[PDB]
DNA sequence: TTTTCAACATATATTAGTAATACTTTTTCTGAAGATAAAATGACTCCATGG
DNA sequence: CCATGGAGTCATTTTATCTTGTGTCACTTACAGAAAAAGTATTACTAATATATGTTGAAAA
């Protein structure tokens, strides 16, 4: 049990699940920023990687 | 008919138009014979074709007759100025002021400036510095200046 | 076709003079528990008229 | 003249409030925009220079 899943997953696995999943979700929440002027402009986030 | 009801509905406007108090209820008061969506299809288009207008007051919404002078004026105005300009002349006497146009148009002060200056070259609006403190430069029609001092 | 030339040109910087315009800046310039109190509660009483 | 009604003052609760809470080391790390002023970038000129730059194209392999 402890050989496979290390003694500290608690800080490890949550940090992994972060850097893989949530980062992809955070920009998936805000991928669009356009201030109000020049109705043709936009900046679209798509991918996150570390 | 677009052109027929255009010109005869412009005829009730150019004759009287039920003044400024005219609302859409007065349409049925004179000619209600048209079906609802039809007379409103041509109301919508004549406002798009700038042969009629709409004023925002009280109940319902007001309409009025409009000729090509101010019609080609506003159609010549930008999409920015489009609602801006006609909204400015709504005061017509006391004028209106900078930031109180910003909230109503839901624009910045960034853009509302350049369209104002555009209207300054246009000279359909004039800079007015009134009784209250000169931080203002309220803007009324370049033609008319009824005011309190 | 590809490569080297060339070649054409055009900025690039100085120093001027204008002159005029336009354009950015800057610089004003304002539109946890147990005392303390406050008030609602209420009884007391002065003081009103009337049979 | 006297019981009454009405109010004025005066105890009395219950709500809104604020000061505290064992000791010592040993590290730790004023809003924003408006107007006025100052000054400047083009905007042409030669006029020499010598790179860069682009293109192109012509010329050669």
Curated annotation (Swiss-Prot), chain A:
Subcellular location: Nucleus
Note: Present with 1950 molecules/cell in log phase SD medium.
Function: DNA-dependent RNA polymerase catalyzes the transcription of DNA into RNA using the four ribonucleoside triphosphates as substrates. Second largest core component of RNA polymerase III which synthesizes small RNAs, such as 5S rRNA and tRNAs. Proposed to contribute to the polymerase catalytic activity and forms the polymerase active center together with the largest subunit. Pol III is composed of mobile elements and RPC2 is part of the core element with the central large cleft and probably a clamp element that moves to open and close the cleft.
Homology family: Belongs to the RNA polymerase beta chain family.
Quaternary context: Component of the RNA polymerase III (Pol III) complex consisting of 17 subunits.
Protein name: DNA-directed RNA polymerase III subunit RPC2
Organism: Saccharomyces cerevisiae (strain ATCC 204508 / S288c)
Gene this protein is translated from: RET1
Swiss-Prot record, chain B:
Subcellular location: Nucleus
Protein family according to the UniProt entry: Belongs to the eukaryotic RPC34/RPC39 RNA polymerase subunit family.
Protein task: DNA-dependent RNA polymerase catalyzes the transcription of DNA into RNA using the four ribonucleoside triphosphates as substrates. Specific peripheric component of RNA polymerase III which synthesizes small RNAs, such as 5S rRNA and tRNAs. Involved in recruitment of Pol III to the preinitiation complex. Involved in the configuration of an initiation-competent form of RNA polymerase.
Subunit structure: Component of the RNA polymerase III (Pol III) complex consisting of 17 subunits. Interacts with BRF1/TDS4.
Name of the featured protein: DNA-directed RNA polymerase III subunit RPC6
């Amino acid at each position: 049990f402890l050989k496979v899943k290390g003694l500290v997953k608690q800080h490890l696995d949550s940090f992994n699940y972060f850097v893989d999943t949530d980062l992809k979700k955070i920009i998936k929440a805000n991928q669009l920023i356009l201030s109000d002027v020049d109705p043709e402009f936009y900046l679209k986030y798509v991918d996150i990687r570390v | 008919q677009l052109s027929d009801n255009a010109k005869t509905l412009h005829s009730q406007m150019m004759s009287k138009g039920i003044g400024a108090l005219f609302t859409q209820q007065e349409l049925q008061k004179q000619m209600g014979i048209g079906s609802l969506t039809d007379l409103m299809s041509i109301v919508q288009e004549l406002l798009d074709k700038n042969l009629i207008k709409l004023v925002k007051q009280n109940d319902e919404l007001k309409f009025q007759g409009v000729l090509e002078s101010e019609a080609q004026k506003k159609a010549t105005m930008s999409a920015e100025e489009a609602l801006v300009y006609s909204y400015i002349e709504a005061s017509g006497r006391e004028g209106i002021w900078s930031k109180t146009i910003k909230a109503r148009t839901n624009l910045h002060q960034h853009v509302v400036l350049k369209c104002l200056k555009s209207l300054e070259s246009q000279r359909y609006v004039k800079s007015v510095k009134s009784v209250k403190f000169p931080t203002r430069k309220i803007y009324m029609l370049y033609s008319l200046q009824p005011s309190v001092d």
